[PDB]
Amino acid sequence: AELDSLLGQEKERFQVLPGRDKMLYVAAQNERDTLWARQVLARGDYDKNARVINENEENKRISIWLDTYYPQLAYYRIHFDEPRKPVFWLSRQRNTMSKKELEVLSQKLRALMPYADSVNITLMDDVTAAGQAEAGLKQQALPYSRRNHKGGVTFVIQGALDDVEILRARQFVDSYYRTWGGRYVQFAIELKDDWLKGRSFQYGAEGYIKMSPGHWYFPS
Amino acid sequence: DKDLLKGLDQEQANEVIAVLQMHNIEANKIDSGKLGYSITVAEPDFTAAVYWIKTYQLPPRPRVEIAQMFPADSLVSSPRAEKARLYSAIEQRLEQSLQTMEGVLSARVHISYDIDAGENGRPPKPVHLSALAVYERGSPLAHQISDIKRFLKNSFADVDYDNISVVLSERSDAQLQAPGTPV
Amino acid sequence: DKDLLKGLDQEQANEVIAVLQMHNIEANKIDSGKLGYSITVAEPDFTAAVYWIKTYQLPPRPRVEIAQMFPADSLVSSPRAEKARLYSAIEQRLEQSLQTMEGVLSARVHISYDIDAGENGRPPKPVHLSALAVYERGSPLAHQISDIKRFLKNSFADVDYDNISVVLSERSDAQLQAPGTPV
Amino acid sequence: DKDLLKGLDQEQANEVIAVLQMHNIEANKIDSGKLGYSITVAEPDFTAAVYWIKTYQLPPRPRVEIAQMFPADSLVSSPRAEKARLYSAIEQRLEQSLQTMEGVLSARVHISYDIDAGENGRPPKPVHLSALAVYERGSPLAHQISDIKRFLKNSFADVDYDNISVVLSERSDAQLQAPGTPV
Amino acid sequence: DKDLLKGLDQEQANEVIAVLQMHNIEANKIDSGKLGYSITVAEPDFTAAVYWIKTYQLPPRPRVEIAQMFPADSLVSSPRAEKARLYSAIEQRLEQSLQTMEGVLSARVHISYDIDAGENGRPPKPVHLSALAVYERGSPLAHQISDIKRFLKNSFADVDYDNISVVLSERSDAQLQAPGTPV
Amino acid sequence: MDDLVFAGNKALYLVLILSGWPTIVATIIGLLVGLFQTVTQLQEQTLPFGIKLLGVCLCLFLLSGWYGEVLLSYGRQVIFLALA
Amino acid sequence: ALSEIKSAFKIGFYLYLPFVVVDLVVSSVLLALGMMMMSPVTISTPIKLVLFVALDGWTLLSKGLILQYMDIA
Amino acid sequence: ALSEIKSAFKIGFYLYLPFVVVDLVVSSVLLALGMMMMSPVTISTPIKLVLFVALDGWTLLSKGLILQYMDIA
Ligand SMILES: CCCCCCCCCCCC[N+](C)(C)[O-]
């Protein structure tokens, strides 16, 4: 009675991989599927050892290990489109390593992932990342401000946004985050009430708002 | 077999069954007539079934509508009760109309009850509306919010596009394959 | 066979059948008379049938009309109640007239109830109207909105084309072939 | 044979039969007296008949008239109620008059119920009228709208041609040949 | 076996079982019908079960809703009572609507009851709202607070984003494996 | 007009209902106490005159706690109609 | 002058109605108790006073009368 | 002025109650004696007068009114 026979009728929903640790690994695509699988093991329908895994869990676990042994490494994300050969994206500018050091890193990652045969390390450009973010916000016609720091970029999107804007912003941010993660570029979205509706005012270098006749407000 | 719940309504029981099947728990529905429905599961699945029943706070409540608080069996109704019943009927008739639009599966609507004061000697306040709706997969949500706003705006004497909030979402993946039976 | 629902009436049962057949689920309707109709399906389809019943929130509600909140049985009733009944009858008569135009399959109408105020000491506000309708396939919707607006404008003392919202949609594809029986 | 509907009225059954025959579905009407009429079809046609019943929302309602909301058989009447009955009868008498014109098959009329305010303290508003009608094939619609407008204008104290809306349409093709019987 | 609790209802029993299972205590639920449910455990686990029953203050006493203090069914009512029932119905209808959003497992909502002043003569005061909600694991909480605020803002005549508090949390780890039986 | 018509009908109606229940209930009591003389003289209603005398005050007090609310609602309604 | 007088009588009419209701009800209850000979004025008058103070009729009248002419916000 | 009047009615309300009670007692006694065809007012007005004077109602009333506004000492 193989494990694949126990997961259901839809076969291609899951992928079973043997590991050097003498344990079966079940690769899932999302939380719902993850729990659909975990139930089988927790019920005890299978007699040998098995484990369930997914991309978000593995990214978190590996980042927690990196925090301890490489506390200054600049990197983006690990992609598991092909689970036998993950791809690890590192910053070209912020890192400084030799080829030997990169190889050592590769081998230690391979020891953390007993289901993978090798890990490919690829160097990506930060300017590219930041540019794709800004281009996407322009494409969506959102209002924004950009702030630059030594190791990160922050985009502030705040005001009296409309429903359409909220929806399109949410969709875009969700798309970008899945590609680049949240380490280098951050988006801050904030709603605030419109002070200016229905009031006459001067705008320019010397703006002010008439709160009413006889009352001047000078923000600065 | 262990008893989870008894004396359920038809529309509670079907919701529990749906939630357990989603998590791969095979369940059974039994009818006792005047005693209602009973739900049962196997022992290996009992723990999980308990955890999910708690986490979703099942069985579900009856659904609440403002007109229940002001039953028309009255010797006298104040202005306040009549106006409340009125608005609580409009809310329901709007939801029932939105479900007829193309591709909408379900929706909910809310109206700002000014009726919590009579406007007694006071100028009237404008109306605000909120709506939630669920769409079929592959729908251009951005392009469909416009239709809803346009439709709601003219349903009332004075409404501004600024005062209408609309939130849309897509249906989740379909649960077609049956759960596995414990070995 | 597993029981999905009991005690339905005729118009609830026919809706449940229509929805399940659309998704390729063969279902059976049984009549128990004073006990109503029952719906049954095969085991291989039980899971899917449950999921769709949840997704569409079946069985459907009874249809709501504002005249139900203000029964004409009442021995004395205020001018507000009467004005509400009046409007809630005009709405229905309009829907029934639109359903006679060429190509319309079904429709809905909504009117701005200014009776949310008595308009005491104040001028009465202008009327606003909203309408939904479904057309036969191959109809020039753009050219047909004009007729509806023209027809609605004159049903009230003061209405502007700007205050009339109209939303149209086409009928979905016809379900003519029967679903397959489980092997 | 599978049962579609039970307990229909005569005028509901004939409408259903008409709609099914138009789509090539052979149906049978059975009379149970106090239990009403029943409609049945063959299995190969069951699916289609269900889908059409949902698409048209059969069986049809009764027909609403505003006088039904303010019955003459009632112990009390406000002036508003009397005024409503009056208008509701004028409408029906116009509908019955137009059908005697040459070529008109059927018609419907609507009047602006200005009575939804008392016209107290204020000058009364002018009347507005709307009419729908259906003509036999080969009729000059353009040359016939003039007659209708002329006729309607003088039925009220103050009406302008600008305030009268008229919509005309032709009869669809005749359904003369019988549907084919399932093999 | 030692008796922990007797005469429980169905919801209290399932709550206790859930809490005990989380801490690895195997418990049994017994039904005595008119006498309710009873919970029992083994002696080696009696001490622990006692300590947790105290620490969580079990069994849970039932949910409070403000309409319970001013029960609608009465011979008499007063403006304060009516206004209270109204607000206590809007609260419940909003919570029931939020639980339909994508990912939300449960939520709770609170409204500022200004009715503790009559708001007669004294001018009425602006509304404040608070909400708690629990999400499925892997949800961008930061990006989801905006939607909630947007939705709530338009449910009332006068609300500022500054006056709406929202607190979100994720679901805890799932309890799927059964506890071990004492040796 | 229609406001004057409404408030007048509502007055006649309120009189009919508020005077209904007391006289029906008193009829039922007086009937059953007259009938069960057919078994026993049933002194314990009417013999303790002090208790019969207290009963009237008790009845009037309780009744006012059910009707004053109604009259208050009616009063507010008519004043609103008169001035607004 | 004439239109004002008329509108005043109209108001007075509405003010009378609830007290008329009281005056009838109290008599019918005294007849139900058989005390046919007692004059009901002795009991109806205090009820009327109670009703008027609980209704706070002076505040309502004084406010609404001014509201008919002024506009206050 | 509009608040003073309302206070006056509030006070007088509570003073009416005991006299009402006395009227009910008299009527019930005449019925229990069956001495039906006598109007009770003729009997109860002497009783109300003698009772209130014998208790100096006017004195207590005057003190109770002044003590809202002064201390007599
Ligand atoms: C003998 C009892 C008399 C009770 C009179 C109550 C006032 C009725 C005023 C007329 C009300 C009916 N209305 C407005 C249609 O005339």
Provide, as residue numbers in chain H, all residues whose Cβ is less than 8 Å from the Cβ of G65.
none
Contact E154 B129 (CB under 8 A): yes
In a domain, C179, yes or no: no
Which residues sit opposite E37 in a β-bridge?
Answer: E8, E31
Helices (H) and strands (E) in chain C — how many of each? 4, 6
In a domain, E126, yes or no: yes
Distance CA F77, CA G17 (A): 11
Distance CA C95, CA C93 (A): 6
CB A207 within 8 Å of CB A201: yes
Contact F66 E78 (CB under 8 A): no
Q: Which one, of E82, C87, G51, lies nearest residue B118 by Cα?
A: E82
In this structure, the answer to whether residues D82 and D132 fall within a common structural domain is yes
Whether residue C126 has a cis bond before it, omega within 30° of 0: no
Q: Nearest C-alpha of chain F: how many angstroms from H2?
A: 18
Q: Positive or negative, the Cα torsion across C77, C80, C84, C86?
A: positive
The last residue of one of the domains, among B21, B45, B60, is B60
Q: Is H2 on the interface with G (CB under 8 A)?
A: yes
CB D147 within 8 Å of CB D101: yes
Interface chains of chain A (3 or more CB pairs under 8 Å)? B, E
Are there at least 3 beta-carbon pairs closer than 8 Å between A and E?
A: yes
The last residue of one of the domains, among E60, E89, E111, is E60
In this structure, the answer to whether residues D50 and D68 fall within a common structural domain is no
Q: Is A192 on the interface with E (CB under 8 A)?
A: yes
In this structure, the answer to whether residues D110 and D140 fall within a common structural domain is yes
In this structure, the answer to whether residues C111 and C27 fall within a common structural domain is no
Contact B23 A9 (CB under 8 A): no
In this structure, the answer to whether residues B42 and B66 fall within a common structural domain is no
**By residue range, what is the domain housing residue B35?**
1-60
Contact B173 A32 (CB under 8 A): yes
Helix (H/G/I), strand (E/B), else coil: A183: coil
CB F84 within 8 Å of CB C121: yes
Q: Which one, of C112, C133, C136, lies nearest residue C124 by Cα?
A: C112
Which residues sit opposite C41 in a β-bridge?
Answer: C2, C27
Residue with tokens 């005697």: D100
Chain G nearest-CA residue for F10: G17
Q: Is A1 on the interface with E (CB under 8 A)?
A: no
| F8 in contact with ligand 1, CB cutoff 6 A | yes
- By what technique were these coordinates determined? cryo-EM
Provide, as residue numbers in chain F, all residues whose Cβ is less than 8 Å from the Cβ of B79.
80
Residues in chain C: 183
Q: Nearest C-alpha of chain B: how many angstroms from C53?
A: 8
Which residues sit opposite A121 in a β-bridge?
Answer: A88
In this structure, the answer to whether residues C93 and C153 fall within a common structural domain is yes
What does DSSP assign to residue B182? P
Helix (H/G/I), strand (E/B), else coil: A19: strand
Ramachandran angles phi, psi of B130, nearest 5°: -130, 145
G25 CA distance to ligand 1 middle (Å): 15
In this structure, the answer to whether residues D19 and D102 fall within a common structural domain is no
In this structure, the answer to whether residues E52 and E67 fall within a common structural domain is no
Provide, as residue numbers in chain C, all residues whose Cβ is less than 8 Å from the Cβ of B176.
47-48, 51
In a domain, E182, yes or no: no
Beta carbons within 8 Å of B115's beta carbon, 6+ residues apart: B80, B83, B84, B87, E86
Q: Which one, of B88, D113, D61, lies nearest residue C90 by Cα?
A: D113
Interface chains of chain F (3 or more CB pairs under 8 Å)? B, C, D, E, G, H
Best to test chain A binding among E150, E164, E170 (most A CBs inside 10 Å): E150
Report which secondary-structure segment, H or E, holds D157.
none
* Buried-state track B54-72, b at ≥16 Cβ within 10 A, e below 16: bbbebbbeeeeebbebbee
Helix (H/G/I), strand (E/B), else coil: A191: strand
CB G58 within 8 Å of CB H43: no
Distance CA D138, CA E113 (A): 69
CB B131 within 8 Å of CB B166: yes
In this structure, the answer to whether residues B28 and B42 fall within a common structural domain is yes
Q: Which one, of E128, E118, F82, lies nearest residue B80 by Cα?
A: E118
Smallest CA separation from ligand 1 atom 1, residue: G24
| F55 in contact with ligand 1, CB cutoff 6 A | no
Beta carbons within 8 Å of E94's beta carbon, 6+ residues apart: B110, E109, E152, E155
Burial of E73 per CB tally in 10 Å (0-12, 13-18, 19+): exposed
Domains identified in chain D, total number? 2
**3-state SS track over B27-94:** CEEEECHHHCEEEEECHHHHHHHHHHHHHCCCCCCCCCCHHHHCCCCCCCCCHHHHHHHHHHHHHHHH
| F16 in contact with ligand 1, CB cutoff 6 A | no
In a domain, E183, yes or no: no
Chain B nearest-CA residue for E89: B66
Helix (H/G/I), strand (E/B), else coil: D72: coil
CB atoms within 10 A of CB B182: 15
CB D51 within 8 Å of CB C174: yes
Provide, as residue numbers in chain C, all residues whose Cβ is less than 8 Å from the Cβ of B101.
132, 167, 169
In this structure, the answer to whether residues E91 and E142 fall within a common structural domain is yes
In a domain, B45, yes or no: yes
Q: Which one, of B180, G4, H5, G27, lies nearest residue A4 by Cα?
A: B180
F4 CA distance to ligand 1 middle (Å): 10
Tokens of E181: 């039986």
In this structure, the answer to whether residues C89 and C151 fall within a common structural domain is yes
**C-alpha E5 chain-centroid distance:** 22
Q: Which one, of G46, D75, G45, lies nearest residue F12 by Cα?
A: D75
**C-alpha G44 chain-centroid distance:** 12
In this structure, the answer to whether residues E81 and E26 fall within a common structural domain is no
Distance CA E40, CA E26 (A): 9
Distance CA D97, CA B12 (A): 55
| F1 in contact with ligand 1, CB cutoff 6 A | no
Q: Nearest C-alpha of chain F: how many angstroms from E83?
A: 15
In a domain, B183, yes or no: no
In a domain, C165, yes or no: yes
Q: Which ligand 1 atom sits nearest the alpha carbon of residue F6?
A: 14
F72 CA distance to ligand 1 middle (Å): 20
The alpha-helical segments, DSSP class H, found in chain D are: 10-22, 43-56, 79-98, 141-153
Ramachandran angles phi, psi of D104, nearest 5°: -70, 125
Tokens of B165: 């909030």
In a domain, D111, yes or no: yes
- For chain A, domains (ranges, CATH) are 1-53 (3.30.70.1780), 54-124 (3.30.300.170), 125-194 (3.30.70.1770)
CB atoms within 10 A of CB B135: 20
CB atoms within 10 A of CB D178: 9
The last residue of one of the domains, among D26, D44, D60, is D60
Distance CA F8, CA G16 (A): 11
Report which secondary-structure segment, H or E, holds G21.
helix G2-32
Quote helix, strand, coil % in chain B, to nearest 5. Answer: 40, 20, 40
C55 CA distance to ligand 1 middle (Å): 58
Distance CA B14, CA B25 (A): 14
Largest CA distance in chain D: 73
Interface chains of chain H (3 or more CB pairs under 8 Å)? F, G
Best to test chain F binding among H26, H28, H30, H31 (most F CBs inside 10 Å): H28
Distance CA F57, CA B99 (A): 60
